[PDB]
Design a protein around this ligand. Structure first.
Ligand code: UZV
Ligand code: ZN
Length: 423
């Protein structure tokens, strides 16, 4: 009943297996960073992300060329061992909170099985891994060994509250949109959270409200992991497929468009802004991509590496993509099974559904306005638990989401910056 079987301490000695110094592949040149394998295929790097983007290596603000008023900078955050220890325990606690629900158990299972496809070969007859879906692990003897992985949680770059999904691209293949998948780096912090307003009219108005209620960071992480699920299955929607927000006078007075991928990931009523014709266009597109993967696996007659047999890897991708196998070992895609897997990843795994499972208060739509950012500490169980988040059972915080009420539960939240009015 435990997703993370070891309670890591940041200062635990390296062992070259699940506590190790690692380099992420072909990223110019970097110094190895201490990393922690918290589950099969999932690693945590308690560092500010100065690696995945060469354009983002400085931790203090740009020349405000692209200064979003919804932003927060602190060059010193996550620079000390105590902070990295607390980041690691916070992230592991949120994974346990997610895994404690049926929906999060299902989502994390999909993610672990969502191994990025072995589509690196130039010969149709051979199956080969794609380099950028691995990390390099320093072994006890000081040499590097390459390890495939699906997901890395890393600390944010310069902008602390811009949680972004980063994955390494291909020269020709669009790995997050062609059914293949790729290793996903999520910038994320458990040490901050956002305020929202409990009345829809106030929450969706840019001039009103200070952010009375705090978002549960388990919801925020689950939201990022939903994107990671889409991207690991290669079914993310192109970010320039957008909704011209015509349902909010403030959104449209500015030129505000919101990606279909975000509306999908929130779910509930937001996903209805993706119209039936284009939704079907997407499902057919991804259905064809899975067939191309079935064609590639059929055409494969050799393996590369000594890490697995050919039809071991064939069975790995038969299980990931839920392919049918005929009496001749030829793979095909069954529409019923495809529609079911696609729907699980896109309609069942949503922010709105996670809200139901956690029984928290949350924004009612993605089409709102940020209110505030708070400093928090979820590591102590007197503050936050796996089973209750902030709304601790058998206290004054159990009822009416009083734990998320930053006015009632004020010692758990320090307001760092207001956003209302800045729009
Ligand atoms: S997967 C990260 C993409 C941008 C962050 C986000 O999900 N915002 O809702
Ligand atoms: Zn999102």
């Amino acid at each position: 009943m435990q997703f993370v079987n070891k309670q890591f301490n940041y200062k635990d000695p390296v062992n070259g297996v699940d506590i190790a110094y690692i380099k992420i592949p072909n990223v110019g040149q970097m110094q190895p960073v201490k990393a922690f394998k918290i589950h099969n295929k999932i690693w945590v790097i308690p560092e500010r992300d100065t690696f995945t983007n060469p354009e983002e290596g400085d931790l203090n603000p740009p020349p405000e060329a692209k200064q979003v008023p919804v932003s927060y900078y602190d060059s010193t955050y996550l620079s000390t061992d105590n902070e990295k220890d607390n980041y690691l325990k916070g992230v592991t606690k949120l994974f346990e909170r997610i895994y404690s629900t049926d929906l999060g158990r299902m989502l994390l299972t999909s993610i672990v099985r969502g191994i990025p496809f072995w589509g690196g070969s130039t010969i149709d007859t051979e199956l080969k891994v794609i380099d950028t879906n691995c990390i390099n692990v320093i072994q006890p003897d000081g040499s590097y060994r390459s390890e495939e992985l699906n997901l890395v949680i890393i600390g944010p770059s310069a902008d602390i509250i811009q949680f972004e999904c980063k994955s390494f691209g291909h020269e020709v293949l669009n790995l997050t949109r062609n059914g293949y998948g790729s290793t996903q780096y999520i910038r994320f912090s458990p040490d901050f959270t956002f305020g929202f307003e409990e009345s829809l009219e106030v929450d969706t108005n840019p001039l009103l409200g200070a952010g009375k209620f705090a978002t549960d960071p388990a919801v925020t992480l689950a939201h990022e992991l939903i994107h990671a699920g889409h991207r690991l299955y290669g079914i993310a929607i192109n970010p320039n497929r957008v909704f011209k927000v015509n349902t909010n006078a403030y959104y449209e007075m500015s030129g505000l468009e919101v990606s279909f991928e975000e509306l999908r990931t929130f779910g509930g009523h937001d996903a209805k802004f993706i119209d039936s014709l284009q939704e079907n266009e997407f499902r057919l597109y991804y259905y064809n991509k899975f067939k191309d993967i079935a064609s590639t696996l059929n055409k494969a007659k050799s393996i590369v590496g000594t890490t697995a047999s050919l039809q071991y890897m064939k069975n790995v991708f038969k299980e990931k993509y839920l392919l049918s196998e005929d009496t001749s070992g030829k793979f095909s895609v069954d529409k019923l099974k495809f529609d079911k897997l696609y729907k699980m990843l896109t309609e069942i795994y949503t922010e709105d559904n996670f809200v139901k499972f956690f029984k928290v208060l949350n924004r009612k739509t993605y089409l709102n306005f940020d209110k505030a950012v708070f400093k928090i500490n979820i590591v102590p169980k007197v503050n936050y638990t796996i089973y209750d988040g902030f709304n601790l059972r058998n206290t004054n915080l159990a009822a009416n989401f009083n734990g998320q009420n930053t006015e009632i539960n004020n010692m758990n939240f320090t307001k760092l910056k207001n956003f209302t009015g800045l729009f």
